[PDB]
Amino acid sequence: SMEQVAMELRLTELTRLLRSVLDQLQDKDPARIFAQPVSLKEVPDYLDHIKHPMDFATMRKRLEAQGYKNLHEFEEDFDLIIDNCMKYNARDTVFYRAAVRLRDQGGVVLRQARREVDSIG
Incomplete structure (x- = not known):
């Protein structure tokens, strides 16, 4: 159907936007x-x-299969990366500290992404 195609162009464009979000988040690491x-x-x-x-490679595989239906799904996976690290590693470790910094810096990127996803629909 023409509707299925329209839907698929939307997913493709969300994938486009999430790929750029992923690149920006990964630069914070x-x-x-x-x-x-x-x-x-x-x-x-x-x-x-x-x-x-x-991890970021596993997210990228899901992304490229258009496996994220909405930003919430993608944020879930980003939050797992941070949250897993902050549990496994102690506070005084380079790993834990790296996750805190990724979370804090990622916040800014994710805040505008939500606005873009709502705005562009």
Whole structure:
């Protein structure tokens, strides 16, 4: 149908906007602490601690399959990256501190993204 196509152009454009959001958030992680999944070879107990692991590469795979239906879904995954880290790692660690800084800096980007998603529809 023509409606299915219109719907698909919307999803494509949301994907476009989320790709730019993802790039901006990932720039706030210059140390690349959150770039890839936590290695189960190197942290064998990780899944005993963290039930839903997340990282920027895994988000990017979902993004490119148009797997985010709305900004809320994408923010959920971003928040997992931060929240998982702040639980697994102690306060006095470079990892925990990196997550705090990503959260604080990401806030600004996400605030305008919400406005853009509502505005452009």
